[PDB]
Design a protein around this nucleic acid. Structure first.
Ligand SMILES: [Cl-]
Ligand SMILES: [Cl-]
Length: 571
DNA sequence: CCATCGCGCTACC
DNA sequence: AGCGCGATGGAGA
């Protein structure tokens, strides 16, 4: 590889992926800042993007709008680039430990090699100190280097590695006479064995700690700090002093106001935190601004800042991701402020925050937004769109009937019964938790095996219910707004949309396309809208569905593609 | 106004 | 593992 991406896949680009790839790549090479990939559900957008990443060879940040999508994209990208550094940067016993490790693998990789793709959630790009410091404080070790064992040990301690001769673990180092064995914070199962002859480095080896294999000799190795908030001792002392002076003034302020409970609470928690500013703390991010000695109101350091300046950003499901990004500042600021009011945190804790949307914009080099339904921001900043409509599988956008509200529930049930005999599944979407609840009984009353999906349901149980649906424990799934982007269930032939004309965010153009899209994974995919009116949003959804289907049907007969329902392994 | 998300605190265990 | 709190998309009083 040598710092270049190698896209590995069992197939090549198909349908209209080639032109999509070509346009985006061209756009990047001409210095176009914002671009948008208008890719229909099931056109392999991640593969399209991977080809794009592979050709331009920039360090890439992939931003998902939740952990589930981040996880999937991470595992997909790992398969696509098995010889490159695909990393995973999400927020927070051993599950916590694994996340800390993966975060460290991600940041250190940005300073080890160019061929790096990091998948992060939009909420998880924080919790970091200066990248300049992170790099500057590396312990760089070379063979031949004049250095004492005890001095190397001291330098490792200063960057937060613990001596631990008994345990064999991440973020520690072992000592046996002349051999020091370092486990980087970024590795669970790999260590660096450093061998001294007198006060000189005779040999450096990479070791597989699980298998015990010695993997090779190194002339040079780089050990990165075991925390992202490490600073030099002088800077650290001054941080401590600033924190102490701030605490004094706020404690006096709170007491002057007769908020003695709050003052007590603040003093107690802060002192406790300061206790471990000698010993090792948790929640240290709250002091980030003082630790960096930076001005009040300063933009925080983020994952974006660890990337080089010529990096690439991919925003997955951009229409949801960007508004989530936009609203985080005000949301976080308001929660933190009440914590400051009740004396849980110092006022400087407000500087431990997400970026404003404007700050995010300042940090962009080049960006590609990815959505089947791009938001207005994406369209306004991108010069038109790179459209991608033809599926390598041949599958077509579904057919749509509009049917009236009268006896709709009886109509739906009969329609569903036909699917069960065809061994096919159905998805239904109502407006409210109430109606969904009623409807799910109606169906249980009529003997239909059905499950109900709503916000109260939890990740692990959601997963279970999707799985059971695919397995055939259920034939129908009912929900409100969770039968949407991300949902990939090829056994679904029917998507029912109740109150399809009852306008709002739930029945917007954008939402209709997304919900319709759940029918685009089956060769017999069909959508029924239960409405007495054809609304404008409805009008546009149906027309766009029709337009795509027509183009795809022509394409399919020009090239002799047979729409095949993608068999997808059940996990 | 509704469904849904994610975040720290507290009342739990 | 559960509270209250403010986000969000888009029409509504
Ligand atoms: Cl010793
Ligand atoms: Cl534009």
């Amino acid at each position: 590889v040598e710092g270049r991406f190698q896209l590995v896949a069992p197939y090549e680009p198909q349908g209209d992926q080639p032109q999509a790839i070509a346009k985006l790549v061209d756009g990047l090479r001409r210095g176009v800042k914002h671009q948008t990939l208008l890719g229909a559900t099931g056109t392999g957008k991640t593969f399209t993007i991977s080809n794009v990443i592979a050709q331009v060879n920039k360090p890439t940040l992939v931003i998902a709008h939740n952990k589930t999508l981040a996880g999937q994209l991470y595992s997909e990208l790992k398969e696509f680039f098995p010889h490159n550094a695909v990393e995973y940067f999400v927020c927070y016993a051993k599950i916590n430990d694994e996340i800390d490790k993966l975060r460290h693998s991600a940041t250190s990789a940005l300073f080890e090699r160019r061929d790096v793709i990091i998948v992060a959630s939009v909420s998880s790009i924080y919790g970091l100190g200066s990248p300049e410091e992170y790099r500057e404080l590396v312990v760089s070790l070379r063979v031949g280097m004049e250095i004492e064992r005890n001095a190397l040990l001291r330098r490792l301690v200063d960057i937060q590695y613990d001596r631990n001769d008994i345990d064999f673990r991440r973020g520690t180092f072992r000592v046996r006479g002349d051999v020091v064995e370092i486990f980087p914070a970024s590795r669970d199962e790999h260590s660096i064995r450093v061998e001294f002859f007198g006060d000189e480095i005779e040999r450096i080896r990479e070791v597989d700690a699980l298998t015990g294999e010695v993997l090779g000799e190194r002339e040079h190795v780089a050990i990165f700090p075991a925390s992202h908030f490490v600073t030099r001792e002088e800077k650290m002392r001054l941080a401590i002093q600033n924190i102490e002076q701030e605490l004094e003034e706020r404690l006096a302020e709170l007491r002057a106001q007769g908020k003695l409970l709050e003052a007590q609470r603040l003093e107690q928690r802060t002192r406790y935190d300061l206790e471990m500013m000698r010993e090792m703390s948790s929640g240290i991010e709250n002091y980030s601004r003082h630790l960096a000695l930076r001005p009040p109101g300063s933009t925080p350091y983020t994952l974006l800042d660890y990337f080089p300046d010529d990096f690439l950003i991919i925003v997955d499901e951009s229409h949801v991701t960007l508004p989530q990004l936009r609203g985080m500042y005000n949301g976080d600021r308001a929660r933190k402020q009440v914590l400051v009011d009740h004396g849980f945190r110092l006022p400087s804790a407000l500087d431990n925050r997400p970026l404003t949307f404007e700050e995010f914009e300042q940090k962009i080099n080049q960006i590609i937004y990815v959505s089947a339904t791009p938001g207005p921001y994406e369209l306004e900043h991108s010069p038109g769109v790179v459209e991608q409509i033809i599926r390598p599988t041949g599958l077509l956008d579904p057919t749509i009937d509009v049917r009236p509200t009268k006896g709709q529930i009886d109509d739906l049930i009969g329609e569903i019964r036909e699917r069960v005999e065809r061994n096919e599944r159905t998805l239904v979407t109502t407006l409210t938790k109430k109606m969904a609840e009623d409807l799910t009984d109606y169906l249980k009353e009529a003997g239909i095996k059905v499950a109900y999906l709503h916000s109260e349901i939890k990740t692990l149980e959601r997963i279970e219910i999707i799985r059971d649906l695919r397995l055939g424990k259920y034939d129908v799934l009912v929900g409100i707004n969770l039968l949407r982007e991300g949902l990939d269930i090829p056994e679904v032939s029917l998507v029912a949309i109740l109150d399809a004309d009852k306008e709002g965010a739930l029945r917007s153009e954008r939402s209709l396309i997304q919900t319709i899209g759940r029918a685009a994974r089956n060769a017999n995919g069909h959508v029924i809208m239960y409405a007495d009116t054809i609304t404008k949003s409805m009008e546009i959804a149906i027309q766009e569905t029709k337009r795509r289907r027509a183009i795809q049907e022509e394409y399919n007969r020009k090239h002799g593609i047979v729409p095949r329902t993608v068999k997808k392994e059940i996990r």
